[PDB]
Amino acid sequence: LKRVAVAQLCSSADLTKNLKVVKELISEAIQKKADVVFLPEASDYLSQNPLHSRYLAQKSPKFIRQLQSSITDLVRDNSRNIDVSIGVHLPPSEQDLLEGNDRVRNVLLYIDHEGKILQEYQKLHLFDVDVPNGPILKESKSVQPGKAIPDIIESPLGKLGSAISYDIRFPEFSLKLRSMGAEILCFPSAFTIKTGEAHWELLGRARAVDTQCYVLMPGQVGMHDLSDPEWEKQRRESWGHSMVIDPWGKIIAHADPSTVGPQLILADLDRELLQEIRNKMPLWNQRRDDLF
Amino acid sequence: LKRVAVAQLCSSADLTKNLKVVKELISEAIQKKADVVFLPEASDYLSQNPLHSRYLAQKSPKFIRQLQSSITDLVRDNSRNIDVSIGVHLPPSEQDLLEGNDRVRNVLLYIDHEGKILQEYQKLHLFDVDVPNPILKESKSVQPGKAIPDIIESPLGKLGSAISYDIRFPEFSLKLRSMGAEILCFPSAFTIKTGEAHWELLGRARAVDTQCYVLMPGQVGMHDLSDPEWEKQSHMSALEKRRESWGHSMVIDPWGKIIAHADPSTVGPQLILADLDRELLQEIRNKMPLWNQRRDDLF
Ligand SMILES: O=C(O)CNC(=O)[C@H](CS)NC(=O)CCC(=O)C(=O)O
Ligand SMILES: O=C(O)CNC(=O)[C@H](CS)NC(=O)CCC(=O)C(=O)O
Ligand SMILES: C[As](C)(=O)[O-]
Ligand SMILES: C[As](C)(=O)[O-]
């Protein structure tokens, strides 16, 4: 049994305020003896519009640098290792701008105990959706789509496949990650209210059952304060309900609905249980690759 | 508003008795103005073992011919059309036998108002599983299919067909949608343990993944598999001579909402109805155009 921490937070437009919350949650995860802590999509910031996102993304490389140092500081101060999986934004590359693409990158970072960035997964599927009884969102206006399938990470919990929010809606991605050797899948998200109440738990449980993997789901929660009285002169609401799901689709950890804002949930991952399930229903020996 | 009927029943090893139940359910569906009726996997029979299955599959063609005739009779007698989707077994062909394959075919039939068979879908993924808290191995008695089922232009809209365990392989449902499906059916004989766990989850998930209406006809109850004449012939003792099914038949919309569900407080056969709305399906697809956003450059 290995210990995982899944964080639930509420990003603002303020990167310093967010970093403080992120640092405390990681510190809390170390004390509760988790080997990896998982934090939601857009943990660095959420923005009012495409232009505000481009503005804040410029501050993101600094945010990341300070995060890396905080991890090494906390590892040393606590006398135990931890790895960090976190959703951030990134500015366009120098090539990207000359190439005529001035959009930010929605990225999931994996940072080991040495503060070393092991993976930068850029979101493949972008949220361009007219939410029924909800907002009209077009992620592709401010965000550039990723170019590659992310590698399996040999994590302290085991083999990890990573994805971001809307990626969860495309089963072929999760299936491919299992084919590559995933034992654990993560879906850090800033999930809307209306789709969240409809599909969050459903999709999380389905992907766990479909792939026979543990599924980790860090989610943003509540109404986001996008207030920026520096950018405004000189709406977003997230579902929360962060959870951990076993390879049989059972919820084994869930966020406390009462407590407002930042919280941490804990679960112990069992490799024997995972192997038992895959042995009893060997789906990966039963696919019809000849046809599909 | 196109009306579908989904049937829940409890198959025995007696094809004559099973046919009677099926005829009554189709008759009821016509009276209730259903345009298509969907019946479960193995509506012709369930068997005690792989040998029993092969013995019984020999009676299946006669079951099917009589069913075809009943359909045209009922259509005539009610002056109203209905199509029928029903799971049966079929014996192996001469070619199968020539190749050393004497296993039966687990087949989903689509039969039209004229008694004409438009599709025989042979199940692709066979249930070979250690059920947590009876070991089942479908491939001992059943040969896997080799074809992807065509989309059927049904009275309700474009139909994709699948059988039970097929539901666990999302790429199959995704393919049906890619080929133009608006409705998916998963006629089934699902175990209690896996039904409790995953029946509702997988039905709803497939609905949401594909943005299709999902139809879920299920076997229910403890099956009576006794066949004294076969038991005599194969020389079985009492000790030599179990199946129980989940039921919970349902109709799910493209957003994942259960809109029709079997009544738990009735034993044996029952019919559920739902009026399907193509406009709801189109609206959902327009607002979240998943099939315009897939990454086929990578998958
Ligand atoms: O805007 C940013 O900066 C980061 N991107 C997000 O927060 C996006 C929306 S634009 N959230 C999702 O895709 C969640 C998926 C979801 O809600 C569903 O699949 O139903
Ligand atoms: O023996 C026969 O005649 C065939 N009858 C069946 O009921 C078959 C295989 S034994 N059932 C399933 O595949 C149900 C799937 C299921 O229960 C799951 O996906 O967990
Ligand atoms: C390497 As595998 C058992 O996830 O197909
Ligand atoms: C259902 As038949 C015996 O006509 O193939």
Give the closest of A128, A199, A286 to B125, CB-based: A286
- Only one residue has tokens 């009576």, namely B224
In chain A, the residue whose alpha carbon lies closest to the alpha carbon of B170 is A171
- Only one residue has tokens 């039209």, namely B112
Q: Nearest ligand, CA of residue A11?
A: 1
Distance from CA of A32 to the nearest CA of B (A): 31
Does A137 contact chain B (CB < 8 Å)? no
Question: Which run of H or E residues covers position B48?
Answer: none
CATH number of the domain to which B147 belongs: 3.60.110.10
DSSP code, position A113: T
- Only one residue has tokens 């249930």, namely B127
CB count in 10 Å sphere of residue A15:
20
**B179 CA distance to ligand 1 centroid (A)?**
28
The domain in which residue B202 lies consists of: 1-299
Q: Nearest ligand, CA of residue A198?
A: 1
Q: Which of residues 198-257 of B touch A (CB under 8 A)?
A: 198, 201-202, 204-205, 208-209, 255-256
Structural domain count, chain B: 1
Question: Which run of H or E residues covers position A240?
Answer: none
**B134 CA distance to ligand 4 centroid (A)?**
32
Task: Identify whether the C-beta of residue B202 lies closer than 8 Å to the C-beta of residue B252.
Answer: no
What is the C-alpha end-to-end distance of chain A, expressed in Å? 35
Q: Which of B148, B246, B172, B259 is nearest to B213 (CA)?
A: B259
DSSP code, position A41: T
- Residue A179 CA, closest ligand 3 atom number: 5
Flag if A202 and B130 touch (Cβ within 8 Å). no
Task: Identify whether the C-beta of residue A263 lies closer than 8 Å to the C-beta of residue A255.
Answer: yes
CA dist., res. B140 & res. A130, Å (int): 49
CA dist., res. B31 & res. B194, Å (int): 34
Question: Which run of H or E residues covers position A195?
Answer: helix A193-211
C-alpha torsion B210→B213→B214→B215, nearest 10: -160
- Burial group, residue A131, by CB count within 10 angstroms (0-12, 13-18, 19+): middle
DSSP code, position B169: -
Strand order of the β-sheet with B117-122 is B117-122, B105-111, B83-90, B36-38, B2-8, B270-276
CA dist., res. B169 & res. B172, Å (int): 6
**A126 CA distance to ligand 1 centroid (A)?**
8
Q: Which of B5, B10, B30 is nearest to B21 (CA)?
A: B10
- Count Cβ neighbours within 10 Å for each residue of A227-248 and write b for 16 or more, e otherwise: ebeeeeeeebbbbbbbbbbbbb
Q: Which residues contact A95 (CB under 8 A, 6 or more apart)?
A: none
Q: Which residues contact B79 (CB under 8 A, 6 or more apart)?
A: none
* Alpha helices (runs of H) in chain B, residue ranges in sequence order: 15-31, 50-57, 60-78, 94-98, 170-178, 192-194, 200-210, 228-233, 278-287
CA dist., res. B217 & res. B186, Å (int): 7
- Alpha-carbon dihedral sign for residues A46, A52, A56, A57: positive
Nearest Cα residue to atom 1 of ligand 3: A181
B164 lines ligand 2 (CB under 6 A): yes
Q: Nearest ligand, CA of residue A195?
A: 1
DSSP code, position A228: -
**Phi/psi at A68 (5° precision):** -55, -40
